[PDB]
Amino acid sequence: PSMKERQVCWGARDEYWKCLDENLEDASQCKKLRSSFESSCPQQWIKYFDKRRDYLKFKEKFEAGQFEPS
Amino acid sequence: MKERQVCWGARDEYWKCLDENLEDASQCKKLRSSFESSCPQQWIKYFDKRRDYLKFKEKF
């Protein structure tokens, strides 16, 4: 994709993630920004970003559990 | 701390099984059982998501 298209893809991924972060992962609340993300990014990049998101979220859950024993 | 070393070792042995069998997890079911038995559930989910990510990142 062009430099512009890459920036629009990365910004649409940032807005979608920012949606999921702020709204405590309710993803049926970010269907508009998910559409924008899917329309803006190469299919391979959407797959890469979704897998990276899952990794980072579960890593955060893992490190949280270690820092705050109950 | 022992339990923690055991879980990391189990995750290493399972992952090395996946590497040697080109990611056919069905070839590594006994090591998968050992991994699940040695690690907290929260950790297994983290490691599984790391593995899914790193294997996909390899195509690039």
Author numbering:
A (entry chain B): 50 to 119
B (entry chain A): 52 to 111
Sentences from the paper on this structure:
The human assembly factor Coa6 participates in the biogenesis of the CuA site in complex IV (cytochrome c oxidase, COX). Coa6 is a soluble IMS protein with a CX9C–CX10C sequence motif, which binds Cu(I) with a KD(CuI) of ∼10−17 M. Coa6 deletion in both yeast and human cells results in diminished COX assembly and activity; however, this defect can be partially rescued by exogenous copper supplementation and in yeast by treatment with elesclomol (via a proposed elesclomol–copper complex). These structures show that Coa6 has a 3-helical bundle structure, with the first 2 helices tethered by disulfide bonds, one of which likely provides the copper-binding site. Patients with mutations in Coa6 suffer from mitochondrial disease due to complex IV deficiency.
To elucidate the atomic structure of the WTCoa6 protein, we crystallized and determined its structure to 1.65 Å resolution by X-ray crystallography. The structure shows two monomers of WTCoa6 per asymmetric unit, arranged as an antiparallel dimer. Each monomer is composed of a 3-helical bundle, with a coiled–coil–helix–coiled–coil–helix (CHCH) fold. The sequence of WTCoa6 includes four Cys residues (at positions 58, 68, 79, and 90) in a CX9C–CX10C sequence motif, which in the crystal structure form two intramolecular disulfide bonds per monomer, between Cys58–Cys90 and Cys68–Cys79, in accordance with the fully oxidized state of the protein. These disulfides tether helices α1 and α2 together at each end of the helical pair. The Coa6 dimer has buried surface areas of 701 and 656 Å2 (for molecules A and B, respectively), which are 15 and 13%, of the total surface areas of each corresponding monomer, indicating that WTCoa6 forms a stable dimer in solution. The Coa6 dimer is entirely mediated by intermolecular contacts between Helix α3 from each monomer. In addition, Tyr97 of monomer A (Helix α3, cyan) forms a π-stacking interaction with Phe111 of monomer B (Helix α3, gray) at the dimer interface. Interestingly, an analysis of the geometries and potential energies of the Cys58–Cys90 and Cys68–Cys79 disulfides revealed that the Cys58–Cys90 bond has a +/−RHHook geometry, which is commonly observed for disulfide bonds within thioredoxin-like proteins,beeing classified as a “catalytic” conformation. In addition, the structure of WTCoa6 shows that the Cys58–Cys90 site is proximate to positively charged residues (Lys53 and Arg55) and bordered by aromatic side chains (Trp59 and Trp94), which partially shield the site from the solvent.
